[PDB]
Write an enzyme that holds these catalytic residues in place. Sequence first.
Site, short mmCIF file in Angstrom:
data_model
loop_
_atom_site.label_atom_id
_atom_site.label_comp_id
_atom_site.label_asym_id
_atom_site.label_seq_id
_atom_site.Cartn_x
_atom_site.Cartn_y
_atom_site.Cartn_z
N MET A 115 4.10 2.58 2.22
CA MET A 115 5.35 3.06 1.65
C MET A 115 5.71 4.41 2.24
O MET A 115 6.87 4.70 2.53
CB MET A 115 5.24 3.17 0.13
CG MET A 115 6.51 3.64 -0.55
SD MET A 115 6.31 3.83 -2.34
CE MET A 115 5.68 5.51 -2.42
N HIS A 129 3.83 6.83 -6.89
CA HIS A 129 3.87 5.41 -6.57
C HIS A 129 3.60 4.68 -7.87
O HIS A 129 2.45 4.37 -8.20
CB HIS A 129 2.82 5.04 -5.53
CG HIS A 129 3.06 3.73 -4.85
ND1 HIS A 129 2.48 3.38 -3.65
CD2 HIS A 129 3.85 2.68 -5.20
CE1 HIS A 129 2.89 2.18 -3.30
NE2 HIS A 129 3.72 1.73 -4.22
N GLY A 134 6.09 14.05 10.38
CA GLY A 134 5.97 14.32 8.96
C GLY A 134 4.93 15.40 8.78
O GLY A 134 3.81 15.28 9.28
N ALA A 153 0.81 -1.22 0.00
CA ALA A 153 0.00 0.00 0.00
C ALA A 153 0.85 1.27 0.00
O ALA A 153 1.92 1.31 0.60
CB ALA A 153 -0.96 0.00 1.18
N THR A 154 0.35 2.32 -0.66
CA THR A 154 1.02 3.61 -0.72
C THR A 154 1.22 4.20 0.67
O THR A 154 2.30 4.72 0.99
CB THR A 154 0.23 4.63 -1.57
OG1 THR A 154 0.12 4.15 -2.92
CG2 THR A 154 0.94 5.99 -1.58
N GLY A 155 0.18 4.13 1.50
CA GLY A 155 0.26 4.64 2.86
C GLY A 155 1.33 3.92 3.67
O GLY A 155 1.91 4.51 4.58
N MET A 165 9.04 5.47 4.30
CA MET A 165 9.86 6.64 4.00
C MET A 165 10.10 7.54 5.22
O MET A 165 11.22 8.01 5.44
CB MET A 165 9.22 7.46 2.88
CG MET A 165 9.30 6.82 1.49
SD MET A 165 8.12 7.52 0.31
CE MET A 165 8.92 7.15 -1.26
N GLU A 166 9.05 7.79 6.00
CA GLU A 166 9.18 8.56 7.22
C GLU A 166 10.10 7.82 8.17
O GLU A 166 10.87 8.42 8.91
CB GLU A 166 7.82 8.75 7.89
CG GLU A 166 6.86 9.65 7.14
CD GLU A 166 5.57 9.91 7.90
OE1 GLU A 166 5.63 10.46 9.03
OE2 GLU A 166 4.50 9.58 7.37
#
EC number: 3.1.2.29
Lengths: 133, 133
Positions: free
Chosen positions: A41, A72, A65, A37-39, A45-46
Amino acid sequence: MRVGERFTHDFVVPPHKTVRHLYPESPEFAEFPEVFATGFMVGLMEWACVRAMAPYLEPGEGSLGTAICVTHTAATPPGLTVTVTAELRSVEGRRLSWRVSAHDGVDEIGSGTHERAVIHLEKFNAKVRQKTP
Amino acid sequence: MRVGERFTHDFVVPPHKTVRHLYPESPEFAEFPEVFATGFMVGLMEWACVRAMAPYLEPGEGSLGTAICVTHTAATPPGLTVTVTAELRSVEGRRLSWRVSAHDGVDEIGSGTHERAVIHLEKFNAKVRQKTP
């Protein structure tokens, strides 16, 4: 800290980081392909940026953040290893802006920017309470 | 689907939508204050856009989030209602774009853009299992 320095973050995507896992309460997500999921990812990253920052933070300090701007562009099944490369783009008092990108070994799966803000953890915890119901 | 139209989407933040829940495998996150993770806000905004564009898919179709560009300007404790307003910005093919924003009942907590690509489910799952270990 230091601008320009890459930081690298490796993570094997487990079955529980796919779309339906982001929101098990979403009927729509329940029928999404089993991909990263993008969320999740974004969270990764954070996570990379938090670790890069950790040594430079005073005891009792943390970060939130404040912005995320990425693409994506390729999907990632569980099993692949996602490598997040974070790079410091600027520091501005409590403000950190990163350039971020990620790869699962096959494709760059996304890239963009990510700003964070150094916070006092307790003062902030207190603040989030006057806001709790 | 009409540019300018508006879909709202309400969600009560449970305790398990906080930072330490996005990534329990992160020791660096276990510290963190119980607040609505950016990663879940990104997902919640996508969930809104998925529902908004549900009535635009043909059978055997799906969508992928291919870009998320949003701020996150206020913290939300568990208990608050986050309303996501998704505004259709462009429909130029397989490509949809939204202006998204979220409010937790007290503060606007974030805004930006989000893009989605209509996909063929079968071909897409096929491309994915070509990547699976």
